């Protein structure tokens, strides 16, 4: 019957799911548990810069609060 | 870097295809196999004569159109102005130019195929 | 094992693909041709088998002679199949293409299209039943499971 | 990446060389769009990206057309590629080496003058608002629609002309 | 302009955005946005012959400033004679010139 | 000449509703109340630094804080 | 005032109209067959096209 | 880690591709009254495996009057495009943030269509060049009106990148908005993959096949694959630009859900139109699209740029 | 920025010396009117880019809009070319001689 259109219509599924969630993931384990910033403007280039600089470590996403 | 990285590597894998597919094969070529294909029946002439196109007309105004696609595209960052008047009332200029020369060539049965 | 374990397994994949995926070339010659369609059509369904058709000769890998082969079609049907890319293989369904069939005593017909090509699979009738024409395919697919080709390589 | 820049510009060379070449308009017209990709790299490194994006897509579009008429009346039996007539290629070949000794003789005689192979890289960017935030090549070219209206005004009725003009041509 | 219709009727269709100093969209002022100014009205008034000789110190800032030659050659002596220590065993770089330097927000 | 557009209605809809689309893209700026607002939302937009005037004492309007109760007020588009 | 070089010219038409040889216009030539998978098995139907 | 997201986004989506040409076989096989594919495997799911290496093993041609260098440069194009458009898609997070995803994806699309061109006039045969000509055709009708469809879209998304998109669809799908763009912008989408009922680059019956009638083996399967990748594109286009999923910051799998459900139901209808549909003579796609979409279009687009203005709506540029 | 003007410079030379020599076909030499254009767009663009002067990066558009204008005003005459000579080769272009 039509059923039989669902199997490959699954593996077509968890195939186009998989790109999103895997690309979503490695933002956030790459940067630290926050999702990728975004340097739409040379605002935030600079902002982003002015992180890396103060971090100590070199990588942006390590933040600094008021402890510092 | 990124960009980059990811077209590289979209070109290299392209191209890993086409070496596999022309390097795993088995081949055995003669001039038969090789020649061109019509139907059954060999060629009566080459391939490369002119081939006149009816659509010349529609072809340049496709030219026209796409500079003029060109002058609409900034629109987005445009529509932020300060002079909102001036600008919409310069792309509705535009647009009314860009339609009426359709209208033209329309009316001038351009749009049609030579025969 | 052995390598020729591997090269058997191997063989085995490459035969296994081919069998599974062979595209006949869109060749229809006579009335055979209906009985072809009919096979086409959806009570039996080639598309099931894996079995699609495609235009193109360069894009086939079975030509299925159905019908009489005339003098003067003989030409294009051997330069068609010649034009075929390798592995190729040939399906002669009716009688007017496995012999002359009616027509063999004719002035114009070429008795057999085994005579212009080589066959594989020859498959009888006037016109075979789709049915027929369905069991010559599972025939063909058989002789392509059986191929010992890589292996044939590696003893060579 | 700081011979980048450099490096594009020299392909860009290379590839207006082969139009220049005069080959068959059809490998003219392949090595035109190798060419419009080429400047759109140097726009963007430059920092524009509306401009560069543009390029590509205008000259897309044209070298398209273009295609369609040399196959339609600027076709031979034997069409000429590069390598067809020993003259084009070795012109070709020549066009690379020759350049290539006078990038080298600029770069000795005087080493800042116009080519600086050392220090190639350092003088590409000038200044950034670091802080800015509309600075993209966007914003200037929407001035057209606010500022520079005179200029929409006649580029756009250069286009309407256009098309009466190519009608009445064709006619 | 040969017919000074724009300047007749007093619009100005093509006659703001000439130099570098002229209005810029969302006051971006562009490279050389003083020495331009400084130029053009030292120039203004008198005219273009006694321009060429009266604001010269000007325009050659604002050349400079532009083009940026002399800069260029300064940058590359410095560099030169800095390979020329190096290969001979004379000078070591900073450690900020090096790479490792205390970073400032 | 009614009958004119009703046949046009009838058997080339595409250029009718193109016309008319046309005409109402024409019309309704001038119709429309809310026209007046869009470019004092685009100055509103606030996209460079605002400089500060020196206090010469001859300034009553332009206010000295943020917060003071003088100078532009955007409550027109907080409650637009 | 001629010359060896111009000798061949010939004065202008009167009308800028030039009597040119006739272009022979050739039109391709198109088996459209017999494998075709519109020619119905065996038809040979060789076209004429222009365009 | 870059390149382990380059293989989580490619090796997927060329899954999907080969997985894309079983469904359509066998949703139009049940809707033709057949069971389509059936036997390769459990419910057919190796058919497409099957076809790649009979493909891929089958000999490789040159025939003695082809340019070989476009003839082999050609197919490697179209799949490259084919792969690299899906990079600045965000579903919801993109590969490659580009400010102008948009712009991106028409240029990299338009130079698609040179592949097909260079296949045809290398191949040095009648078909080929027809092919090649009446993809000439189809490029010079869609180009046109896409461009506008995205603009008068983009009038009220307020930006070219894509990324931009989810956030002006937080609550509601553009398509009611601009249904009557998004019907174009289909049937536009339709035509450009040179899909039925547009099936006029490689119409079977009319040309034995367009420009791929002289590629066979792996090219052929190259110029296959760019097919239905940009299918696949195309439809997940849609679903971004109109058909809004749903973005909520802290639950982003819901959006890849919600787009792949969206994009899947599109790829089908894709198909389901293929069964249903006979086909355009390329004169006759070329006059539907300049003599009736492109005067729609161009009036909306006008009404489009009205519309920001009399309802003191523009978008916030960044 | 020096080095790529002067390679921009020099691939526009080419590409006029390309026009100014011709070869046969009338749309070559087209092209390479072509080229000249692209080399004068991106030399044009990277000025205005590099002095940060957006107020004149309208002009590189307009330089777009009228060299396409130009190509399709050259691509009718080289219909009508081919219409009465049969071809495009510019041999043929030789009949006000006399
Ligand atoms: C004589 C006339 C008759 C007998 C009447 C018979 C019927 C006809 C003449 C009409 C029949 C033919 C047609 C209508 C066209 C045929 C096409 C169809 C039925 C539907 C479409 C199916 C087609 C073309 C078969 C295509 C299947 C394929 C597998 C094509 C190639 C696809 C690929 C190579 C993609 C595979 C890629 C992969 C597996 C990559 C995976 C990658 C990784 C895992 C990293
Ligand atoms: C995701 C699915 C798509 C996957 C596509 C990739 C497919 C990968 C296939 C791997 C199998 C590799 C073996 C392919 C052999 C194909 C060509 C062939 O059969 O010739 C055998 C050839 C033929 O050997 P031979 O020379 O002894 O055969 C006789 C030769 N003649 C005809 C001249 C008399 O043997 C090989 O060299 C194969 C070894 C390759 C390792
Ligand atoms: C784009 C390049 C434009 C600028 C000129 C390029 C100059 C370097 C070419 C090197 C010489 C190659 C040649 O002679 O041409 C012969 C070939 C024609 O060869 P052919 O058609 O005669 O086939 C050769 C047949 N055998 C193998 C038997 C001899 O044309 C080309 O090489 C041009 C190919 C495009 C190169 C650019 C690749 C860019 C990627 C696609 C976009
Ligand atoms: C067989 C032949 C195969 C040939 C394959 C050819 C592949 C071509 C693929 C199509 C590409 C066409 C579109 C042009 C590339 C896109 C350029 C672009 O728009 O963005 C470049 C990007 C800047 O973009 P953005 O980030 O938005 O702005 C800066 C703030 N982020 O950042 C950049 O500057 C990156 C610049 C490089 C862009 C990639 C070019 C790769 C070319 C490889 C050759
Ligand atoms: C300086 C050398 C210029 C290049 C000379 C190329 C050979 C030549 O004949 O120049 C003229 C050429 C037309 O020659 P052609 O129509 O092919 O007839 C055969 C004539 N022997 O016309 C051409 O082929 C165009 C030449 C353009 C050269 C541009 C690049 C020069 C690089 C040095
Ligand atoms: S074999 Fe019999 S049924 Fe088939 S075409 Fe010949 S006469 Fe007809």
Known sequence: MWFEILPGLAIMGVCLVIPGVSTAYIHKFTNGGKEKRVARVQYQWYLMERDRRISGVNRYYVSKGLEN | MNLYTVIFINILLSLTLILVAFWLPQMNLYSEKANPYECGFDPTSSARLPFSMKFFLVAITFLLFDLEIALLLPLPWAIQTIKTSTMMIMAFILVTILSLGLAYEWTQKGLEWTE | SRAEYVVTKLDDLINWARRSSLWPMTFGLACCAVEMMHMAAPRYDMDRFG?????????????????????????????????????????????????????????????????????????????????????????????????????????? | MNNYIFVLSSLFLVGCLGLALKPSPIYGGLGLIVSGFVGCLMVLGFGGSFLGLMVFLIYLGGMLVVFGYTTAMATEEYPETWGSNWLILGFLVLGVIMEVFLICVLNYYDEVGVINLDGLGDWLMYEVDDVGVMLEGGIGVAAMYSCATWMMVVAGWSLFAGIFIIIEITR | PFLDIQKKLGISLDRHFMFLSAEQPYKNAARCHAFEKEWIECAHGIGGTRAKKECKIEFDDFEECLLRYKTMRRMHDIKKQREKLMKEGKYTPPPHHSGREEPRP | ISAFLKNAWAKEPVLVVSFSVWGLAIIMPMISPYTKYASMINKATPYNYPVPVRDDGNMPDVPSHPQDPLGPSLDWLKNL | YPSKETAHWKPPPWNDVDILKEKAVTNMTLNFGPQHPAAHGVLRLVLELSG | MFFINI????????????????????????????????????????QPFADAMKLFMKEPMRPLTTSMSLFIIAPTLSLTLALSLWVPLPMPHPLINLNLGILFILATSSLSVYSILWSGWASNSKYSLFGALRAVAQTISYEVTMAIILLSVLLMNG??????????????????????????????????????????????????????????????????????????????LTTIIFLGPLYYINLPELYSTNFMMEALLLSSTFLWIRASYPRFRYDQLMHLLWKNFLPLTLALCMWHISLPIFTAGVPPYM | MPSTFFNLTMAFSLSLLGTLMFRSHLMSTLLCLEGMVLSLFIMTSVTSLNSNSMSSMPIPITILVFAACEAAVGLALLVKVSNTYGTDYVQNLNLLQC
């Open chain 8, 7 to 46: 293989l989580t986004l490619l090796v997927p989506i060329l899954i999907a591709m080969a997985f894309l040409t079983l469904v359509e076989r066998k949703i139009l096989g049940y809707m033709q009254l057949r069971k389509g594919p059936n036997i390769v495997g459990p419910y057919g799911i190796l």
């Open chain 3, 51 to 156: 079995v699609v058709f495609r235009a193109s000769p360069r894009q086939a890998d079975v030509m299925i002679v159905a019908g009489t082969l005339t003098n003067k079609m003989a030409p294009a049907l051997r330069k068609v199949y010649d034009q075929m890319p390798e592995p190729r293989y040939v399906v002669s369904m009716g009688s007017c293409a496995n012999g002359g069939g009616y027509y063999h005593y004719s002035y114009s017909v070429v008795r057999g299209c085994d005579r212009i090509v080589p066959v594989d699979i020859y498959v009888p009738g006037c016109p075979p039943t789709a049915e027929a024409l369905l069991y010559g395919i599972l025939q063909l697919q058989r002789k392509i499971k059986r191929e010992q080709k890589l292996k044939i390589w590696y003893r060579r």
């Open chain 8, 159 to 236: 930006s070219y990148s894509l990324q931009t998109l989810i956030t002006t669809q937080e609550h509601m799908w553009l398509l009611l908005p601009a249904w009557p763009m998004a019907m174009m912008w289909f049937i536009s989408t339709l035509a450009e993959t040179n899909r039925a009922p547009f099936d006029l680059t490689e119409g079977e019956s009319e040309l034995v096949s367009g420009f791929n009638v002289e590629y066979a083996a792996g090219p052929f399967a190259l110029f296959f694959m760019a097919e239905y990748t940009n299918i696949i594109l195309m439809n997940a």
